[PDB]
Design a protein around this ligand. Sequence first.
Ligand SMILES: OC[C@H]1O[C@@H](O[C@@H]2[C@@H](O)[C@H](O[C@@H]3[C@@H](O)[C@H](O[C@@H]4[C@@H](O)[C@H](O[C@@H]5[C@@H](O)[C@H](O[C@@H]6[C@@H](O)[C@H](O)O[C@H](CO)[C@H]6O)O[C@H](CO)[C@H]5O)O[C@H](CO)[C@H]4O)O[C@H](CO)[C@H]3O)O[C@H](CO)[C@H]2O)[C@H](O)[C@@H](O)[C@@H]1O
Ligand SMILES: OC[C@H]1O[C@@H](O[C@@H]2[C@@H](O)[C@H](O[C@@H]3[C@@H](O)[C@H](O[C@@H]4[C@@H](O)[C@H](O[C@@H]5[C@@H](O)[C@H](O)O[C@H](CO)[C@H]5O)O[C@H](CO)[C@H]4O)O[C@H](CO)[C@H]3O)O[C@H](CO)[C@H]2O)[C@H](O)[C@@H](O)[C@@H]1O
Ligand SMILES: OC[C@H]1O[C@@H](O[C@@H]2[C@@H](O)[C@H](O[C@@H]3[C@@H](O)[C@H](O[C@@H]4[C@@H](O)[C@H](O)O[C@H](CO)[C@H]4O)O[C@H](CO)[C@H]3O)O[C@H](CO)[C@H]2O)[C@H](O)[C@@H](O)[C@@H]1O
Length: 717
Amino acid sequence: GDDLFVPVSNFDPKSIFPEIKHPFEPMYANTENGKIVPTNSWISNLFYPSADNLAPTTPDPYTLRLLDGYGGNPGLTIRQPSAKVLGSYPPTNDVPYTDAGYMINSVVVDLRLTSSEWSDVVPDRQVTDWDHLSANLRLSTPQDSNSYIDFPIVRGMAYITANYNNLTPQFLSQHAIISVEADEKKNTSTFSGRKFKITMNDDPTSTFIIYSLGDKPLELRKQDNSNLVASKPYTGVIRVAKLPAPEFETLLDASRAVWPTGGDISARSDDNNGASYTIKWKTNSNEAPLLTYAYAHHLTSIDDSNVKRTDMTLQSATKGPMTALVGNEWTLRETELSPVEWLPLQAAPNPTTINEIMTEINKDIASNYTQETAKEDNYFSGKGLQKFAMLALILNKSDQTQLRNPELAQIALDKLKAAFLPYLQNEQADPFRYDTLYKGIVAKAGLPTSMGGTDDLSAEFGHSYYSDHHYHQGYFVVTAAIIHHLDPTWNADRLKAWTEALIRDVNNANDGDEYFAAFRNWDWFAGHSWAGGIKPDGALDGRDQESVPESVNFYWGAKLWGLATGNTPLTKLASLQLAVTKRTTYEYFWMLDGNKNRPENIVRNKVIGIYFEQKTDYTTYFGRFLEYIHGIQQLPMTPELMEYIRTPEFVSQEWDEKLGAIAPTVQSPWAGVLYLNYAIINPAEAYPALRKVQMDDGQTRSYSLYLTATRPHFFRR
Ligand SMILES: OC[C@H]1O[C@@H](O[C@@H]2[C@@H](O)[C@H](O[C@@H]3[C@@H](O)[C@H](O[C@@H]4[C@@H](O)[C@H](O[C@@H]5[C@@H](O)[C@H](O[C@@H]6[C@@H](O)[C@H](O)O[C@H](CO)[C@H]6O)O[C@H](CO)[C@H]5O)O[C@H](CO)[C@H]4O)O[C@H](CO)[C@H]3O)O[C@H](CO)[C@H]2O)[C@H](O)[C@@H](O)[C@@H]1O
Ligand SMILES: OC[C@H]1O[C@@H](O[C@@H]2[C@@H](O)[C@H](O[C@@H]3[C@@H](O)[C@H](O[C@@H]4[C@@H](O)[C@H](O[C@@H]5[C@@H](O)[C@H](O)O[C@H](CO)[C@H]5O)O[C@H](CO)[C@H]4O)O[C@H](CO)[C@H]3O)O[C@H](CO)[C@H]2O)[C@H](O)[C@@H](O)[C@@H]1O
Ligand SMILES: OC[C@H]1O[C@@H](O[C@@H]2[C@@H](O)[C@H](O[C@@H]3[C@@H](O)[C@H](O[C@@H]4[C@@H](O)[C@H](O)O[C@H](CO)[C@H]4O)O[C@H](CO)[C@H]3O)O[C@H](CO)[C@H]2O)[C@H](O)[C@@H](O)[C@@H]1O
């Protein structure tokens, strides 16, 4: 096969963007290991203090919290969410057909790992090392560096692993320990051995198994109804697992000896129109096969020839049941990559619609580009730029689309250039700066006043704190790929450097690139992108993601850039990321009927809303209205979104259950978003509607007619 984890470029972004150091630094990071602190990772909370020390880090199926002060002894808190809490909102006609508005997990101390040495002292925390799949966390006694616990925190771990060094183990819970079986022997208050089956008084019953892997055994006294203290400082590894069911005690016994410490990810493409990525787990020893929990989308795409599936399942924070897999290597295949490039698969519109489309195109090209592309911020500017990039696109590929008008094609391309040029020269309202701390490019607007910013970290949607980089930069990349494809000589060198700095800021696939962090927004274990960046005072529900199509839009743009420059590894990686996105979207975000990964109340909502690591919220960041919530999952409508990502089956289910009732009532621009989505299953009804209703600010009527008129099953109504 051919390798996808290669650098895009090694251009030094300092030649284009003024350099800064991010004002908000990582408090708990080993500054002396040469690694880059990730801005949008599941490990990101670990690097900063949080309010009440309640910022969760979720390797899944365990959720962890550091140093939260309930239960007295600070340490590492574990929660394992067997059950979820549904909450609802006060009913309004803004959202008519809903009963479950949000799903959350209870912040409860299922079990804490600490020390009796830390009764009157608060331990110093540090992130000693990290990669994409893991982080090692050390809690040590202040001013006594040789007394510490190391926690290798790794995606999917079946146990919590704690390397104690010169400290006295203590295990507290918020529940009561009703029973304790040492070394499988059954009445006492002091216990001895290397295995401890403890059971709690919660609902449902949580059962934990504790393993002592060090040279000496452990001696635990039941101090409270909630605490097990050891006899003396212990040196060695202690592991704790939740027993999902009684018939898996032997499985946990067999795998107690081997722990993950990290993982290396690689990716290949093949000439069978496919691609794959592989996770090679880093372990401590190889004396036993590795046990690891996998997400629903892992089970359906893994190559089964080097792993054994088990029946052991625990609930994840928000992605449904995870299933343990046995093995040290995972190869995940996507055999069906997207065929989409610049246009719909049928590039030519129904012949009865050409005069109508050409009339609308002519109107849309006559628009005032300055007022529709020089918006207050980069985001809305990008929507305008891409929407006009589409019009120049279809007009200058008239040999395929049949929208012939050489004069209009050239004006479309000129006006697009004029409007895009200020962004290429970094002379827009909100110019970018290159950040040496976190190795990315950030908008200037959210920076403090001393760097030319507005002091508001929420300016530009949090882009200065690395939020929504793929939403924003997706539009500019699509635009530039279209300009560079239609006219490869226009500002070629600055264009190639500028566009690739953007692709690299979001999607650098290789540490060999010294200037950009690796995979800022993509997460290879979760199989989708994250939007939430640096969240001062903690991201108390972990990373978040709202828009899927806007993430799709960056990976489509990356792919188009790959087509416009002849870069096969870039084109192939973008495809693979689009294929994983599609699979995971239908596992977790856009729920068909019978979805196994959510409570039925949530499934009837059809979209998850805003998705976080620790909760899901049927709402938006800009208004709790049904057409906003479903509409945001429907723009920008591109050939990628129309031909590949949004499937007839889902569009159809969603339309019969939610949108059919509301799209025709809608009297805002969201009417155009909805009826363009509808053109996917019913172009015959959509086309007349798209002639009348209002357009989204990133949508044009002409392009929308064009995408509808190119559906294969289109007919005059
Ligand atoms: O009231 C008058 C006022 O109203 C405006 O109009 C509305 C219009 O702006 C709205 O536009 C939509 C736009 O918001 C939507 O955006 C998403 C964007 O949400 C997503 O962003 C999120 C961030 O929003 C978010 O930060 C959180 C913050 O929102 C929350 O409120 O508080 C927290 C602070 O304590 C903070 O954490 O963070 C995440 C990352 O973690 C971001 O991803 O990403 C993209 C862009 O970034 C985008 O998809 O986009 C829609 C386009 O699809 C826009 O429609 O639309 C409404 C439609 O009716 C309007 O009401 C007016 O325009 C103004 O003139 C007025 O001031
Ligand atoms: O329309 C007029 C005005 O509407 C506002 O739009 C609303 C929009 O702001 C709102 O979105 C919801 C978010 O506010 C909510 O975000 C929550 C965070 O705010 C909360 O943070 C903190 C935590 O960081 C801090 O440390 O402590 C606080 C107390 O413990 C805690 O509150 O973070 C939460 C996760 O950690 C997060 O939930 O998130 C919701 C998603 O669950 C959003 O729905 O949504 C409204 C309805 O959709 C919007 O109307 C505009 O912003 C205004 O400018 C408008 O004028
Ligand atoms: O009509 C909008 C008007 O009201 C404002 O909107 C509300 C919004 O505030 C609300 O968000 C809450 C989150 O705050 C909440 O988060 C939890 C924290 O509150 C707590 O401190 O910690 C836990 C961690 O365990 C957090 O999860 O989560 C609930 C449920 O997820 C949210 O509902 O959500 C409403 C729905 O969108 C929203 O309408 C807005 O700020 C006003 O300006 C506006 O006028």
